[PDB]
Amino acid sequence: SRSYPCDEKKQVIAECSNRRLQEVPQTVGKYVTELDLSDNFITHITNESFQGLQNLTKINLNHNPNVGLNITDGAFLNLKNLRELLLEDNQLPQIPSGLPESLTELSLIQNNIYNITKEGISRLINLKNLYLAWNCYFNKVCEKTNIEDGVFETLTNLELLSLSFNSLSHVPPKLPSSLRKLFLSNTQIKYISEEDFKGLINLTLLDLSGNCPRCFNAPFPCVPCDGGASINIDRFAFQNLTQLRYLNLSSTSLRKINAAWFKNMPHLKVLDLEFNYLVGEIASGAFLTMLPRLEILDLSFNYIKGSYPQHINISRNFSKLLSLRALHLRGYVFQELREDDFQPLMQLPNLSTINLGINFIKQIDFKLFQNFSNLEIIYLSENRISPLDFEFDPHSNFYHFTRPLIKPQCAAYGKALDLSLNSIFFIGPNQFENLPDIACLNLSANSNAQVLSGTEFSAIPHVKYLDLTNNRLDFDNASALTELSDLEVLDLSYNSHYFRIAGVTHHLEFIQNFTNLKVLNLSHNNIYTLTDKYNLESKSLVELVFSGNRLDILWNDDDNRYISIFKGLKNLTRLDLSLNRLKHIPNEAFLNLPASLTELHINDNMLKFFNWTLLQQFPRLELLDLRGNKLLFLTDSLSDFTSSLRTLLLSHNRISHLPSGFLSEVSSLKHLDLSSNLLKTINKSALETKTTTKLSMLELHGNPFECTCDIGDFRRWMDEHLNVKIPRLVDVICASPGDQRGKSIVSLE
Amino acid sequence: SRSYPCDEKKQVIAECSNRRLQEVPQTVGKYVTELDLSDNFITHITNESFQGLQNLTKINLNHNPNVGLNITDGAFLNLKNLRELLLEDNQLPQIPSGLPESLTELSLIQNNIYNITKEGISRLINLKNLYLAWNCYFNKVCEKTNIEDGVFETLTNLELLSLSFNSLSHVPPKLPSSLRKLFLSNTQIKYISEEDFKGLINLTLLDLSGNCPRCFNAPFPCVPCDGGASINIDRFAFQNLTQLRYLNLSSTSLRKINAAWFKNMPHLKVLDLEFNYLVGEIASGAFLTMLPRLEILDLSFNYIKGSYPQHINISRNFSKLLSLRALHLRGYVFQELREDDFQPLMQLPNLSTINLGINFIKQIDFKLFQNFSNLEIIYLSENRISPDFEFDPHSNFYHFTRPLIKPQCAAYGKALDLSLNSIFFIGPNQFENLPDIACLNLSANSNAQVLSGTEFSAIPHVKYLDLTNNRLDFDNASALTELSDLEVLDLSYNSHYFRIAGVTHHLEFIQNFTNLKVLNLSHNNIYTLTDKYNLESKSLVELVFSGNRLDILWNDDDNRYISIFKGLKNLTRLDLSLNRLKHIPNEAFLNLPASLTELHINDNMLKFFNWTLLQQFPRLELLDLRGNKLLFLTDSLSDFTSSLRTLLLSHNRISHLPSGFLSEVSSLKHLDLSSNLLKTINKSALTKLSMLELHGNPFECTCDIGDFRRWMDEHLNVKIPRLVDVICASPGDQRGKSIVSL
Numbered sequence A: 001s002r003s004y005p006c007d008e009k010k011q012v013i014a015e016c017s018n019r020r021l022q023e024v025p026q027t028v029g030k031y032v033t034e035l036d037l038s039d040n041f042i043t044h045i046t047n048e049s050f051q052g053l054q055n056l057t058k059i060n061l062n063h064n065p066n067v068g069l070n071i072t073d074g075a076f077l078n079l080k081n082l083r084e085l086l087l088e089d090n091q092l093p094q095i096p097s098g099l100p101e102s103l104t105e106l107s108l109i110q111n112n113i114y115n116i117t118k119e120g121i122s123r124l125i126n127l128k129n130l131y132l133a134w135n136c137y138f139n140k141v142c143e144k145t146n147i148e149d150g151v152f153e154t155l156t157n158l159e160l161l162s163l164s165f166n167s168l169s170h171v172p173p174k175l176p177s178s179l180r181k182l183f184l185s186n187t188q189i190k191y192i193s194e195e196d197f198k199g200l201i202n203l204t205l206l207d208l209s210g211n212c213p214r215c216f217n218a219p220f221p222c223v224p225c226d227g228g229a230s231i232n233i234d235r236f237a238f239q240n241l242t243q244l245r246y247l248n249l250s251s252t253s254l255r256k257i258n259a260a261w262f263k264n265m266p267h268l269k270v271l272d273l274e275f276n277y278l279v280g281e282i283a284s285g286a287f288l289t290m291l292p293r294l295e296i297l298d299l300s301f302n303y304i305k306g307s308y309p310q311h312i313n314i315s316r317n318f319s320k321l322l323s324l325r326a327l328h329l330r331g332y333v334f335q336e337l338r339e340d341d342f343q344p345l346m347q348l349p350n351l352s353t354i355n356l357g358i359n360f361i362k363q364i365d366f367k368l369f370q371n372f373s374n375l376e377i378i379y380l381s382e383n384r385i386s387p388l389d390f391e392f393d394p395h396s397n398f399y400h401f402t403r404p405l406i407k408p409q410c411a412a413y414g415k416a417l418d419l420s421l422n423s424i425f426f427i428g429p430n431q432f433e434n435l436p437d438i439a440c441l442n443l444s445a446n447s448n449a450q451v452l453s454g455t456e457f458s459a460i461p462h463v464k465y466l467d468l469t470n471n472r473l474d475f476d477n478a479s480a481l482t483e484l485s486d487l488e489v490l491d492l493s494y495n496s497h498y499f500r501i502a503g504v505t506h507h508l509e510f511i512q513n514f515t516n517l518k519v520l521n522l523s524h525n526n527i528y529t530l531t532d533k534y535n536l537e538s539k540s541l542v543e544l545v546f547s548g549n550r551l552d553i554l555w556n557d558d559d560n561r562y563i564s565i566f567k568g569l570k571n572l573t574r575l576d577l578s579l580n581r582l583k584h585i586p587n588e589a590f591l592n593l594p595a596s597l598t599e600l601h602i603n604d605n606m607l608k609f610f611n612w613t614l615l616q617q618f619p620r621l622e623l624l625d626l627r628g629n630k631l632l633f634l635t636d637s638l639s640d641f642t643s644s645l646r647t648l649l650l651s652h653n654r655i656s657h658l659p660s661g662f663l664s665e666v667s668s669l670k671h672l673d674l675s676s677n678l679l680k681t682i683n684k685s686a687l688e689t690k691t692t693t694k695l696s697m698l699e700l701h702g703n704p705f706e707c708t709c710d711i712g713d714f715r716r717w718m719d720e721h722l723n724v725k726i727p728r729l730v731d732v733i734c735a736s737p738g739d740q741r742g743k744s745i746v747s748l749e
Numbered sequence B: 001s002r003s004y005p006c007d008e009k010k011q012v013i014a015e016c017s018n019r020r021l022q023e024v025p026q027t028v029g030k031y032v033t034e035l036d037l038s039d040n041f042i043t044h045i046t047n048e049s050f051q052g053l054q055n056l057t058k059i060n061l062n063h064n065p066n067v068g069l070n071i072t073d074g075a076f077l078n079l080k081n082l083r084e085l086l087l088e089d090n091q092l093p094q095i096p097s098g099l100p101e102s103l104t105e106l107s108l109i110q111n112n113i114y115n116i117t118k119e120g121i122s123r124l125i126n127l128k129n130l131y132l133a134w135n136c137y138f139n140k141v142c143e144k145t146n147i148e149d150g151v152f153e154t155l156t157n158l159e160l161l162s163l164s165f166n167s168l169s170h171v172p173p174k175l176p177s178s179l180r181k182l183f184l185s186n187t188q189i190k191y192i193s194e195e196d197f198k199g200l201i202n203l204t205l206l207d208l209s210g211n212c213p214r215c216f217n218a219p220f221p222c223v224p225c226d227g228g229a230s231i232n233i234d235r236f237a238f239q240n241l242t243q244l245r246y247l248n249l250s251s252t253s254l255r256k257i258n259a260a261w262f263k264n265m266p267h268l269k270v271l272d273l274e275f276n277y278l279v280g281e282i283a284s285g286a287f288l289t290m291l292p293r294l295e296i297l298d299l300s301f302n303y304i305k306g307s308y309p310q311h312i313n314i315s316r317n318f319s320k321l322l323s324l325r326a327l328h329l330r331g332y333v334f335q336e337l338r339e340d341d342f343q344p345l346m347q348l349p350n351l352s353t354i355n356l357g358i359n360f361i362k363q364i365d366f367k368l369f370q371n372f373s374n375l376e377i378i379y380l381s382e383n384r385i386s387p388d389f390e391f392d393p394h395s396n397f398y399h400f401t402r403p404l405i406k407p408q409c410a411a412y413g414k415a416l417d418l419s420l421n422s423i424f425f426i427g428p429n430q431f432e433n434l435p436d437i438a439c440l441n442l443s444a445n446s447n448a449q450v451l452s453g454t455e456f457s458a459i460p461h462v463k464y465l466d467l468t469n470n471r472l473d474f475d476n477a478s479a480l481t482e483l484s485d486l487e488v489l490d491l492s493y494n495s496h497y498f499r500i501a502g503v504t505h506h507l508e509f510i511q512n513f514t515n516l517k518v519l520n521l522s523h524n525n526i527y528t529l530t531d532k533y534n535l536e537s538k539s540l541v542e543l544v545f546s547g548n549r550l551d552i553l554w555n556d557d558d559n560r561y562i563s564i565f566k567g568l569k570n571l572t573r574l575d576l577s578l579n580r581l582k583h584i585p586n587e588a589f590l591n592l593p594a595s596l597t598e599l600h601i602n603d604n605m606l607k608f609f610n611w612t613l614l615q616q617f618p619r620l621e622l623l624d625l626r627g628n629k630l631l632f633l634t635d636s637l638s639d640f641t642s643s644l645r646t647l648l649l650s651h652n653r654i655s656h657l658p659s660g661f662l663s664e665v666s667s668l669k670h671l672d673l674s675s676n677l678l679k680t681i682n683k684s685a686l687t688k689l690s691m692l693e694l695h696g697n698p699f700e701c702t703c704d705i706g707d708f709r710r711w712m713d714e715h716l717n718v719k720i721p722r723l724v725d726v727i728c729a730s731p732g733d734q735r736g737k738s739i740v741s742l
């Protein structure tokens, strides 16, 4: 039977999140092994709350109540199989007493716990991972964290322990030697002694970041060690961490890096040294000799304040980082990159990524990149290159964003060069001389206003994916970009600047001159007028994104010119016409859409009416997205007009009535979205059929249902069609009558 | 009493526009002089739609039924004072028969009327103006316009006649010589004979634009005359048009201008010559010696296709344009503008606007603007300088009629607009040799620099500075301080660097201006600042801070911005819209300046509001909390303020109005409670009140509402806009109805 109020499934997982629930549901399936109740309004947990759910291994209770959680002594003690328990963001004032001995993972991130004690933790001898971070931090009103001596030593299976963003003052003593990962970032620990990590011969991660932070231009309330001194690490603090892979020392105000810290640290993979004062060490770097297995090195944001050196000064000793794959030098800040300045990097056999974002670089000697063994990612974004509930996510890196530097879709094609966010307002004849064979290029947001004529990319003719978004291109020549015969993806989003001017020219004819162009983005260009050729044409093109233009104007009733604007795109399967302010589509215009389409989006327009008949012309059409329009009526004979349609999206429309058979007219329909509409009911007329329906999803939330015996039939139909998934029954709600107002439609008797 | 469904006044005008009306309503005030039914769903009009309203001078039925309008003969012919009748955009297939003799103003703009007959027109002998434009145009399905011979010679009081955007072929013969203004744009009239206008000796305006149009890059379906040829104007076509003030020959494919066309028209004020092929004529141009009283000349978009000349070629004969005030030369298209290129224009005494928009100029000798008599507006926007229906039938078709520079900037003095170029930084000499610019636009140049107190030294008297839509690097606390007279600064849309935590953002310079009055930091995405976390000014009167991240700046774990605005000691107007505020910390709200009269926190996400804090804002007059998620109102409003005249609360979630909220609301004139969740209004809640807005609420229309219905009827001094939209949610029988209809 239809579970409630949780969406249940096998993988047995109850998904009961974000549901305005005020108590723990007692109507949960008893085979459930994992239960997600995050983001609810639950305020009390007692021993009665999971009475029948003894089969539970995982409970999530983060963010309860959503806009503190009173949990009773021993409330979960009976859950003999409970292993993972998530209590984040719950204003707990202490570790709840009497937690079950069977727990392996516990997270108390983002509470008010300032006392960690034997009574709460020491019995939990099976803990693999303990998360206690972010309980006292910044200007939060909270106390220094008291850690009862030995609380952790009974935890002889503890693999992870995280205490970051608490005021600790010292590494706690008596840590179990089972530790693999220790996070102590922003714990206000000024000094590290030789005893602090003495027996942690299995550690692979240590995070001492944010202790003695560098506070200039801090995006948070930041207090430095006195005088802005550096963290102080004893020469022997890492003597026995021979398993260390990851070390984070970002924002510890280091001027000097002791080579001997790495003496017995032969597996170090990742060394994070952001937001220190290391410009000097970058020019000498004894320590670099100690790290020939290091793969990622991050020296970002060590700029000296107020200084703008002509050049970056990299020590010869970078040449010893022989396993280096990625070097991050954001925010060093310098004027000019010369070939000689990167000599020490040129022979590193596996250095694939070099990242120079946000250095305010004015000039680069591009030929230098050829001399490298094999750069795959040249990231120069954000420079000054001109022509030739709570703010921070406690589960993320705090000092840098973790997404890929270049979109993967682009980088897969080959070597990439990103010059986004510079002032390259114009591509000169030699701008791309001496580059490697670039497959992926990003020039987004250079305020580029030029006329691309067919020669500007000649020096790098094999670009397969080109990003020219957020420029101001002047499409005044029909040969534009044609020197890129291999081109497969082209993004021209956000170049409206000239497109919006009726009087200037707009030539899109070059689209035809490409044999392998598969994807094209013309979104948010405000396209309403083109010169000479009113048609887009390509034999290769599979996908055109045309959202945010003015098809309203292009297909107005007094203008025939653009009636076939898309017909010439013979191979097209995917078309996005969202955000074109369409009030009505002329039938000839619609019939002139490519018959090859499988996926058509006309969402978020203003359609009042949709000629359904016209689907006869679209035999391969699988998906149709009309969400967010003004639609009033559905055709009563839809199966007459398509037999390919698998997905139909109609949410946020003005449909108040279904025609008979609709749900069974189908017949390839598997997903039908009728949410946020005006349906007051579903009559048995719509439920009639002679055929087996194959519908697997039907979306109904957001409809103002009439909750009387007048709706029993649909309710019946729901019981007799468990196979049809219907999401968020708690949101499929009665508008009326009074007694029923607010309840799910599934819970009226 | 309360009019329904219209909104009546003597300021005697019944505003009945856009109220979803199915037919002309019987319930209009009998003393109404002007009635606006435009944008309703009316489909039929007859001899008894207006029966009681014999005192009506104006009717507006434009755009009905709003998504054809059947009008019977004589439907209107009882209305004996009826002077102005607007019937635009109604799908009328013929002029209606039986219109009153009394008519002076008739618009039938945008219908389906292709016969202009004596039957419809000739009896209307008092017509002053007749609009018939846009009935057959572009690829519309429509027929050539048949104009019955002499149809207009009955109309011997006719002042303006408009026939644009109709297929005419020839100027109609037999036109009343009462005409001052004749609009024949886009009427396919390829030939202008000596006879066509000979009679009309009182013409002040003639529009022959778009006949033999220049079709390259047309924003509409465009049919050139054959071989793209020029309109044919006969030597003596304008011989007797001695009163002409306005002449529009835009897009008539002229290559040559006959100087003697202007011989007998020495009072010509405004001459429009856009979208022609007049580059040759611009360089030589006899006709320029024949325009002694001309004020406005537009020669925009005469570019030669494919052409990119080094310099503009301006005939010496421009020096005869002695009364010239404005010269428009958009889209001529040339590379460089030199001093010697503009010598002919320099001695003109009243030339105050030069417009060089959209010319693709790469370089400019700025010193030349100085040697002019008195430029007030130097407009160079959009260049390449480095360091139902589409068109409105009531606007000009070839250009925009908005001012070039915002008048709030131009008022201060000589203005220079370099917007939408590529001046990505301001070098040390960018502004040498300029006039004393008072108003300066640099919007949208992708400017990435660190302004530092010296970049505007050469034009230190700027008072309104627009740097919107750049990417400024605010890394120096002396930024802009050279402009000590600055009164307006617009830094909207420079979020490029603000959005990056790791770069610095210095906003200290604000305090360093003694006369800064208005500052706009909107849509900068500001969530972090460097060293100085506070904005301060002793002068600043207004700060716009919408589109930033006060949700972050005032979040609970950070105290640093708790006083971000308090040092704006003089501030009366503050705008914190669009800052994603879920809540505002009490101390933060208390630290907003005490001198505030006007505060907007609209379009945020506020779930609650501490009304008690208003006790500390003794001058606050307007409080604007629209578009939030507020769930409740204080019952104790009179205790927290005695200043507030306007309170705006639409688009929230308030479901109960507190007792003593109307009966006590001591200073409060205007209360906008529309689009909330009110289901009824308790008699407990029932005043300096004059406006009260309630549309959009889901009212239960069952008895009591009645007490409130009473209330309305008893205080009519409380205006309640949009009675038609104050609509019942329940029960089923009332669903569509105004609460007032029960």
Ligand SMILES: *[C@@H]1O[C@H](CO)[C@@H](O[C@@H]2O[C@H](CO)[C@@H](O[C@@H]3O[C@H](CO)[C@@H](O)[C@H](O)[C@@H]3O)[C@H](O)[C@H]2NC(C)=O)[C@H](O)[C@H]1NC(C)=O
Binding pocket: A164, A181, A185, A205, A207, A209, A246, A247, A248, A270, A272, A394, A395, A396, A397, A398, A399, A400
């Ligand atoms: C200092 O540097 C260390 C090592 O680079 C950073 O450690 C990484 O911290 C992140 C953020 O918590 C961890 O990400 C999370 O991992 C889990 C487990 O797979 C995943 O479920 C989450 O969605 C999230 O990705 C990351 O695993 C961890 N790295 C390793 C190797 O364990 C640390 O965050 C840095 N400290 C600060 C304050 O930035």
Ligand SMILES: *[C@@H]1O[C@H](CO)[C@@H](O[C@@H]2O[C@H](CO)[C@@H](O[C@@H]3O[C@H](CO)[C@@H](O)[C@H](O)[C@@H]3O)[C@H](O)[C@H]2NC(C)=O)[C@H](O)[C@H]1NC(C)=O
Binding pocket: A409, A410, A469, A489, A491, A493, A519, A520, A521, A523, A543, A545
């Ligand atoms: C301009 O248009 C293109 C084409 O739509 C946009 O690129 C496409 O973006 C979609 C995301 O909407 C990508 O699909 C996603 O791929 C991931 C990766 O495996 C998958 O996990 C997601 O569920 C989703 O399917 C698609 O890969 C991507 N295509 C390409 C060629 O990059 C582009 O983002 C648009 N540009 C702008 C500026 O908005």
Ligand SMILES: *[C@@H]1O[C@H](CO)[C@@H](O[C@@H]2O[C@H](CO)[C@@H](O[C@@H]3O[C@H](CO)[C@@H](O)[C@H](O)[C@@H]3O)[C@H](O)[C@H]2NC(C)=O)[C@H](O)[C@H]1NC(C)=O
Binding pocket: B164, B181, B185, B205, B207, B209, B246, B247, B248, B270, B272, B393, B394, B395, B396, B397, B398, B399
């Ligand atoms: C060709 O040039 C002529 C002369 O400049 C243009 O004349 C102007 O046309 C506009 C648009 O109809 C008139 O504006 C309207 O005037 C009324 C009256 O006050 C006002 O209520 C409207 O809202 C609108 O402003 C304007 O008065 C008229 N100029 C004169 C002196 O009568 C004409 O539009 C041009 N033709 C084309 C096709 O662009």
Ligand SMILES: *[C@@H]1O[C@H](CO)[C@@H](O[C@@H]2O[C@H](CO)[C@@H](O[C@@H]3O[C@H](CO)[C@@H](O)[C@H](O)[C@@H]3O)[C@H](O)[C@H]2NC(C)=O)[C@H](O)[C@H]1NC(C)=O
Binding pocket: B406, B408, B409, B468, B488, B490, B492, B518, B519, B520, B522, B542, B544
């Ligand atoms: C940045 O903020 C300033 C100040 O708010 C904005 O300029 C102001 O814009 C308003 C319109 O929102 C102007 O008010 C209008 O004035 C006219 C003219 O008398 C009146 O008819 C209108 O009803 C309204 O009151 C205001 O004068 C103008 N202020 C100044 C000093 O120019 C500005 O638009 C904002 N910038 C951007 C890019 O959004």
Ligand SMILES: *[C@@H]1O[C@H](CO)[C@@H](O[C@@H]2O[C@H](CO)[C@@H](O)[C@H](O)[C@H]2NC(C)=O)[C@H](O)[C@H]1NC(C)=O
Binding pocket: A381, A405, A406, A407, A410, A418, A420, A421, A442, A443, A444, A445, A467
């Ligand atoms: C090209 O550069 C632009 C600017 O860096 C990239 O845009 C960013 O992309 C990520 C992922 O989509 C977004 O989260 C950021 O919002 C974008 N920044 C801006 C300013 O828009 C773009 O992704 C890069 N393109 C490729 C193909 O790698």
Ligand SMILES: *[C@@H]1O[C@H](CO)[C@@H](O[C@@H]2O[C@H](CO)[C@@H](O)[C@H](O)[C@H]2NC(C)=O)[C@H](O)[C@H]1NC(C)=O
Binding pocket: B381, B404, B405, B406, B409, B419, B420, B441, B442, B443, B444, B466
């Ligand atoms: C400075 O230049 C910009 C760009 O030309 C002007 O912005 C236009 O202003 C009008 C009237 O407010 C708007 O309707 C347009 O949409 C604006 N265009 C753009 C691209 O933003 C701006 O008004 C000019 N500033 C001054 C002070 O005159």
Ligand SMILES: CCCCCc1cc2c(CCCCN)cccc2nc1N
Binding pocket: A301, A303, A305, A306, A307, A308, A330, A331, A332, A333, A358, A359, A360, B450, B473, B474, B475, B502, B503, B504
């Ligand atoms: C890496 C972040 C550096 C932020 C400070 C900062 C430094 C800048 C520099 C380097 C320091 C020069 C100071 N005169 C040059 C140009 C623009 C500069 N803009 C900035 N916002």
Ligand SMILES: CCCCCc1cc2c(CCCCN)cccc2nc1N
Binding pocket: A451, A474, A475, A476, A503, A504, A505, B303, B305, B306, B307, B308, B331, B332, B333, B358, B359, B360
């Ligand atoms: C004023 C409208 C002119 C539109 C055509 C147009 C012409 C342009 C020119 C002049 C044409 C020269 C062709 N090499 C130069 C630079 C950019 C140009 N960009 C354009 N969009």
Ligand SMILES: *[C@@H]1O[C@H](CO)[C@@H](O)[C@H](O)[C@H]1NC(C)=O
Binding pocket: A453, A454, A477, A478, A479, B306
């Ligand atoms: C397009 O650009 C090429 C290269 O500049 C040029 O030779 C060709 O003339 C251009 N096309 C047009 C129509 O100007």
Ligand SMILES: *[C@@H]1O[C@H](CO)[C@@H](O)[C@H](O)[C@H]1NC(C)=O
Binding pocket: A515, A516, A518, A539, A540, A541, A542, A571
């Ligand atoms: C049609 O699309 C397929 C798949 O992308 C592609 O392989 C083929 O090149 C396309 N057809 C043409 C004529 O380019």
Ligand SMILES: *[C@@H]1O[C@H](CO)[C@@H](O)[C@H](O)[C@H]1NC(C)=O
Binding pocket: A587, A588, A611, A612, A613, A614
């Ligand atoms: C759909 O379009 C066809 C022809 O293009 C037309 O005959 C039919 O009337 C239209 N149907 C609807 C319901 O508008």
Ligand SMILES: *[C@@H]1O[C@H](CO)[C@@H](O)[C@H](O)[C@H]1NC(C)=O
Binding pocket: A306, B452, B453, B454, B475, B476, B477, B478
């Ligand atoms: C601001 O710029 C000025 C002049 O360009 C320079 O003298 C001054 O040092 C700058 N201030 C800072 C803190 O860099």
Ligand SMILES: *[C@@H]1O[C@H](CO)[C@@H](O)[C@H](O)[C@H]1NC(C)=O
Binding pocket: B514, B515, B517, B538, B539, B540, B541, B570
């Ligand atoms: C405060 O505002 C008023 C209005 O502009 C102004 O007259 C006064 O000078 C300002 N105060 C100061 C100290 O500038």
